[PDB]
Amino acid sequence: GTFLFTSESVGEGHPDKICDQISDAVLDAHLQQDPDAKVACETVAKTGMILLAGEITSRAAVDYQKVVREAVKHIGYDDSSKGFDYKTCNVLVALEQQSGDIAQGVHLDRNEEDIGAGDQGLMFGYATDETEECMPLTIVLAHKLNAKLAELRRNGTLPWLRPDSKTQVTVQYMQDRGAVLPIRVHTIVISVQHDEEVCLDEMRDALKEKVIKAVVPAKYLDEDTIYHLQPSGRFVIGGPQGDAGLTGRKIIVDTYGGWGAHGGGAFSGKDYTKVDRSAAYAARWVAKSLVKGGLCRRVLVQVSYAIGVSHPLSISIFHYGTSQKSERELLEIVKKNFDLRPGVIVRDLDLKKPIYQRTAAYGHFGRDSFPWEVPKKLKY
Amino acid sequence: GTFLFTSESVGEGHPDKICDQISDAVLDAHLQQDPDAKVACETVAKTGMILLAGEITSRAAVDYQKVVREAVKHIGYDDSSKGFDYKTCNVLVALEQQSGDIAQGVHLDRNEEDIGAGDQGLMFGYATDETEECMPLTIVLAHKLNAKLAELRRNGTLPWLRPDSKTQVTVQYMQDRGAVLPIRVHTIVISVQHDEEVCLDEMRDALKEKVIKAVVPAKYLDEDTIYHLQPSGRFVIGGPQGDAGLTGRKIIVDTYGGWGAHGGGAFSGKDYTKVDRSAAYAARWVAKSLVKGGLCRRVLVQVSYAIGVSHPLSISIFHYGTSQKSERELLEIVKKNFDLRPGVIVRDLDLKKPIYQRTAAYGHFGRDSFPWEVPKKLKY
Amino acid sequence: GTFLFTSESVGEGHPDKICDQISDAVLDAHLQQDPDAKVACETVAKTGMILLAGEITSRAAVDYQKVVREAVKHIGYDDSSKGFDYKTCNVLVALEQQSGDIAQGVHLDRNEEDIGAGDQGLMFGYATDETEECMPLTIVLAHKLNAKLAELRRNGTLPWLRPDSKTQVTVQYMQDRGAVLPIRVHTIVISVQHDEEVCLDEMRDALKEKVIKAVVPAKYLDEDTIYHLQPSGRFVIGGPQGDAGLTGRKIIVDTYGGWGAHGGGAFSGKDYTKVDRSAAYAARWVAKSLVKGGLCRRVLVQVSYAIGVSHPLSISIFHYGTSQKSERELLEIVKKNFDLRPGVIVRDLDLKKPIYQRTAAYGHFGRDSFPWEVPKKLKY
Amino acid sequence: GTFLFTSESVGEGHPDKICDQISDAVLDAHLQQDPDAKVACETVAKTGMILLAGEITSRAAVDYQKVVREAVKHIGYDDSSKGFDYKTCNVLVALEQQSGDIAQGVHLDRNEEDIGAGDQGLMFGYATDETEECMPLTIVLAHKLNAKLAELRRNGTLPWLRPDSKTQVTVQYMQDRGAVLPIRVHTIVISVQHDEEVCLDEMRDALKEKVIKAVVPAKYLDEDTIYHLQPSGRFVIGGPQGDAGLTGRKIIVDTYGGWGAHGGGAFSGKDYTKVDRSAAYAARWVAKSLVKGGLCRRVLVQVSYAIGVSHPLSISIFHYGTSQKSERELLEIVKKNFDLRPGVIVRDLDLKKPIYQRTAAYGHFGRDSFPWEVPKKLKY
Numbered sequence A, B, C, D: 001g002t003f004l005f006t007s008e009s010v011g012e013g014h015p016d017k018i019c020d021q022i023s024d025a026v027l028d029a030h031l032q033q034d035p036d037a038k039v040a041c042e043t044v045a046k047t048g049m050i051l052l053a054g055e056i057t058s059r060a061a062v063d064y065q066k067v068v069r070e071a072v073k074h075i076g077y078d079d080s081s082k083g084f085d086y087k088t089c090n091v092l093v094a095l096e097q098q099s100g101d102i103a104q105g106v107h108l109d110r111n112e113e114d115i116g117a118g119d120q121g122l123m124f125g126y127a128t129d130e131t132e133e134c135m136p137l138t139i140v141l142a143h144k145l146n147a148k149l150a151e152l153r154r155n156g157t158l159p160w161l162r163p164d165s166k167t168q169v170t171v172q173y174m175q176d177r178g179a180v181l182p183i184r185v186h187t188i189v190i191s192v193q194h195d196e197e198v199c200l201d202e203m204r205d206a207l208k209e210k211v212i213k214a215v216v217p218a219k220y221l222d223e224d225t226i227y228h229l230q231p232s233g234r235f236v237i238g239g240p241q242g243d244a245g246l247t248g249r250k251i252i253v254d255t256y257g258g259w260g261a262h263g264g265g266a267f268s269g270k271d272y273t274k275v276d277r278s279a280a281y282a283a284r285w286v287a288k289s290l291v292k293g294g295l296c297r298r299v300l301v302q303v304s305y306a307i308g309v310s311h312p313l314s315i316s317i318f319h320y321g322t323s324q325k326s327e328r329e330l331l332e333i334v335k336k337n338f339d340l341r342p343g344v345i346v347r348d349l350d351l352k353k354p355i356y357q358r359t360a361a362y363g364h365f366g367r368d369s370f371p372w373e374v375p376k377k378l379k380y
Ligand SMILES: C[S@@+](CC[C@H](N)C(=O)[O-])C[C@H]1O[C@@H](n2cnc3c(N)ncnc32)[C@H](O)[C@@H]1O
Pocket: A040, A055, A098, A099, A101, A102, A105, A118, A119, A307, B014, B015, B016, B164, B165, B166, B191, B192, B232, B233, B234, B235, B236, B237, B238, B239, B242, B243, B244
């Protein structure tokens, strides 16, 4: 009757996640001055180095040096003894205009409504009634565990916690008629960067007690639950200095933690015309609607695009057999109710607002507000 | 009865794929001198720039300058008028040792057999009987279409084709008792970098005729099949100069094109102890076996790991209802037949051999040899 | 009676000189929008790479990417087969604000007239009546020889000449009562980058005939004059790809070719408040005046500064015994006639005008216009 | 009767000087394993960044990461609150082989004795009997003042002193029959990086009392001597973070502080075949000999070279009228006694020994040992 399922998350100071956060700092910063900015900024993190590579065409004036350093300040990386510091690190800027070849194909000369896609791609959307957030529990708890760490780090409670971390959660489920029901937490993993001077025992206790027991409902915990708390033993070297960091390299953490499917596309660093972002948020929007709106417990939604073309080439809706209504019918309800041309998406989900930096840690989905988490009512 | 499903691939000269190929050039190059090398090399591509960021502990002496430039030579990027050239570009090397903190947690002091994982993570494996390769058709054809382009570029037939390209394939399927049957190709997309001097008409004809009709079985093509051939119109600016490139940013192209699931982990740049690679190939190995070995038409396999721990924390097998035998039974057959500790995987799949550069374009799966595509016989 | 004396120059495509030219491109570009810009931009050239490191506080908006690439376009480096190309190279921008610590010390809150120096330093000025330009012949001819190469390269006459070159000139002098008289050219050296396909003989002939005989008065040439024309034999690999390039590493080429003295300070990349530039041009201005104005045949002038202090700490005038009037008297004539506070210099020599890129090749002295080559009339 | 003359020096933590020191760290490191290494390594320093650009052909295996970081560790830059730290900064390595075009011209196929020059150039040598070191006092004292700072910083006495500093010394001389006699110190300048928490008054006192009075003979100080001690007021931001740093940009500090002449060539980063170094040390060697050996009080010596040619194209000896013997005669004594072909120089001055890092701060001349400071006895 039961199966296991694992998902991971990572903290704000994880080297990949830094880049993701920096690339959206850079995005917000343009959108703050030029709503119709075209942004494809990739960040790379390594010891002492933040580098920005990509394409930007904008009217905004932007101090990348300020934008990056504040981003790294907000993360907590603010002293050499933490293995990284916004004050004294290097920032390289290798940023150009958008390819004029791309410029003409995507966005020159057409109503903002009938804008062609920014690239080709495939994007997925998912939602499940296993949780309030309409997300898998495995990923929801993974995020919350890194969230709690951050809370405890910045409030003082564990001033030995450093910014870099990774959680991983495995849950024992059961199959209820195509839908899934979480039953117990089988294994939690936490590895978090720390100050030299604390011992291992002290950390593991604190993670079991202050983090996990605070975060996981005790109904999902029991005497058989395995804990792997600082499994390595030592994690004083962290962030960029431990491990090179790249934008778009935590795109399963950003979405559904192995559940449903992924199209390949990264989110951070990209304005609305990048359909890797706009369509992906739309597809979430749609899936969450279909569940909340009563048609299914669990749903998967594909879309695909061609560069230069506005409508999608394909739309697919898989409901796992959790729906009375057919597969051609949900397709028709989605079609009645959504306009998945990237230029109409942006109106509905307000995607010119510089709110992207909030998205670049703890998931782009299942989260407090954001426009795409707010389900539309369905007419059918 | 039918649903659509899209998948993309990209050529050898796609800026991401360059990095993936360069990161495995760097990996092979170490493994050629030091079989037990520890390698985490990330490449970044942008106009005139290749950069290497990461961690390497090895006894090998390596001329990164040679290793990269030959990699870029083999790709075809060998003149300024192509938008990139191995002779005259910049190569930056920001490479350090592996974190000693990681070193002690993973691999110091233990039989190579009982080596702990290199990191935490989740990894998926998939196989489907819809094709000979045991892969989805959508992704198989996407790869072949970029493959044909490369053939035609390097043999002279279309000496206007440049290295950068992207294909995308959408197939109309039908559900046969949990399994899937491809029926028709609904939409093909191809966008490929070209010389200034050729016109659009000439290219589109050549793609329809020389590439698609050569690659797609005519049984999957008809008068309703949509073609989007150079949808942008112009693609003279390509490779790194068009678009920044990062290692590990085509990890859905590298695997199953939206089918099954993905754990988040990138492949290129990593030796065997990186379970993002070793377990992922093992999970493919297992899924392909279960199908070829007669137990299922379509199967998905999760595994997860903890950094420092050798055994996996979880193993999951989903067969889509295409199997007579239960879900606890396939689990037991896999367990009887495989040892998913990363240090035993490496023996069975021969993963110290410097064959990784071959993997970094056209998929890591469904491909000619490679040890993980060769199914093990099952005892049960 | 006679002594030898050598001086070198280098072309517009010499890797150091590229940087010097790029750093003044960046300077002019600010001064074009913000006359009171504060600029300390260092450029570094190597294969495929231009990098900008330094400090800039300005109101100007500047596309460094455009500014650099055009600079490299104007040089001639515009194809991969020339070993460097403005289109496809990498440009890294590591540029910050000016240190606020420096900002307060130098320039916040004081009449632009009584501005303190930008740094400490020593600067020299020299002039000699051996030539019309009031410069040493050795250096004048070195420059002209690289100048002729450039003329012949850009007009077609020798389309095998590439941008990188170096000349070197040695002249046999005689001592006339403290002053110097050029007598013969003892040795000329020329090494210039070329296309693969031309032979050595052809080049050497062309250099002897088209360059040297065009440039050197035949009165200074004879049958004993040594020529070293492509002394290496082969110079196909040139510019940044041959040799790393740094701003401020041809500061003896920029000035007097070993004659007189140098204070250590580089010129390119710096606005007026950098006294390494402003005082050095002033000291030239003064020396040229004293000679043209009849008081000496040959003169050397030191000045020094303290960071934050406006007046100079010292002024020295050495006339080589070529002056009727004493050493305390020339000091007094200079003092009567010049105001060497950097903020008064800038008014007199018009040093906010974006004319600096013209200075960054072929010398900052002995040249057509520029304000500092135009001697002031002296009252005494 | 009297004239003023200024000279500057800078500390071990001055951003230029860092690069110079790093480039010789890299040189020594090769010479330690491969005596006949060919090295042209340029370093660039800026906030968080050390970059190495250049050409190296060697059999040595070198961990540039270790070599640089230790170099920066030895300097004192070892915490974020000092504005730079060897632990956490970025090190970029853009290092290639030597141009094969240069390789064939300079050093393939010829007795190590009759090796051609590594490049063209002009180099100067100087010596003066005004001091024991046979150097100008202005520069000797400038160096000692930065030397004392370093002593006091590393021993604890002023643990507020940071690595970055600059001194400047002006001395009132008199002309004794072509030679020079120091009379008084007219102006001393010191600006040194400090901790936030010390006040200005405290520093200025300490510099007057602990540094200057310790370093300058009281015979050269009096009540008229001007002091400019922290002239800016504030210097908390220092090293690379204050000011970009380049190798070879303190080449007047490295030599004679404005006295004599300079050929343009930098020293650090270069093995013996780079005549910018080998000939310059030889010319010092020669000048010091002529003075110590009794033929002159003050002497200047030019040499020049052609790339590929072993003998020098020119040799010049100016003795300022401080010698009984003529100008053609000293030429003949030098010629009798020295072999200025770069491959014979290296034997005599032992220039394959990895002692270069000691040279890269406080001057390459007037210093304790080094082979070129040890005068040869003259036969004449
Ligand atoms: C369109 S780009 C990514 C968008 C990019 N970030 C930008 O600047 O907007 C994605 C890939 O599509 C391909 N591509 C680039 N230029 C293209 C063009 N003009 N038309 C079609 N495809 C293009 C390249 O292979 C490129 O790496």
